[PDB]
Write a protein that binds this DNA or RNA. Structure first.
Length: 223
DNA sequence: CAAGTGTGAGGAAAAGTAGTTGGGTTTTTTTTGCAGTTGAAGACA
């Protein structure tokens, strides 16, 4: 649902997980890494789930010999996605993007699709107040402050936006139209995007991620 | 190709403390009325 809600890909990936994903068994939380060096053994189950997820899309997409997923279909799932409002979710992911980390969302900072800009300032005027309350200062430093806020007073000197499954539905429809080198490029095009998404919620490692990716890649070819 | 010990540092933050100044008391060790009187210069036998 996160994006290319391609209903079939749920058990596609569930199946590869079925496959070599811990001998077709639900990944359990890793162990009590007692050692202080905290080696990257990648046993963090999810990290591998996302890895299988990505892989699945690439493989399945790479070899859909029957041509079940049309050339022009893959990029459509990309055009529809590349941003949009969010019945709360995407607005959230913007708020997380704003930890201004490795500059994958930094520019989103810059762009910030109009309103996204607006509902952002809304969430700042509501949840940033959870900000603070100078002490003593003869009331002085404080009063002055109060006056200043008295000054710019402001805060106002479809209910419009939509929910999550609404947005999800409408892009599933926006791809409503289902029934060589370029598609390979498009596929890589799309995978980078999800890499952005899944990586962005998490500790990324613009390569550990792929280090992780690399790992199971290796794991897999022991058929 | 690959997994596994040993381990040095980089980093964060509130309050304190620095430097540079000033403030700041502190703290501090032009006669206008009167009447008399003395001493004086001057003078004398």
């Amino acid at each position: 649902m996160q994006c290319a809600l391609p209903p079939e890909f749920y058990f596609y990936t569930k199946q590869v997980i079925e496959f070599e994903e811990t001998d077709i068994r639900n990944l359990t939380l890793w162990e009590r890494t007692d050692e202080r060096h905290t080696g990257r053994v990648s046993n963090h189950a999810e990290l591998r789930v996302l890895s299988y997820f990505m892989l699945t899309i690439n493989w399945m997409l790479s070899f859909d010999r029957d041509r079940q997923y049309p050339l022009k279909w893959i990029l459509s799932l990309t055009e529809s996605l590349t941003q949009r409002t969010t019945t709360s979710e995407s607005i959230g992911r913007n708020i997380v993007k704003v930890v201004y980390p490795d500059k994958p969302t930094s520019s989103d900072y810059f762009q910030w699709s109009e309103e996204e800009t607006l509902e952002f300032l809304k969430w700042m005027e509501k949840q940033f107040l959870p900000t603070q309350t100078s002490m003593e200062m003869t009331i002085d430093q404080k009063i002055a402050r109060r006056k200043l806020y008295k000054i710019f007073p402001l805060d106002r000197e479809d209910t419009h936006q939509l929910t999550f499954i609404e947005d999800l539905q409408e892009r599933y429809a926006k791809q409503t139209p289902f029934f060589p080198p370029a598609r390979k490029e498009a596929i890589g095009r799309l995978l980078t995007h999800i890499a952005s998404q899944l990586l962005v919620d998490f500790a990324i490692s613009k390569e550990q991620l792929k280090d992780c990716i690399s790992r199971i890649k290796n794991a897999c070819l022991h058929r």
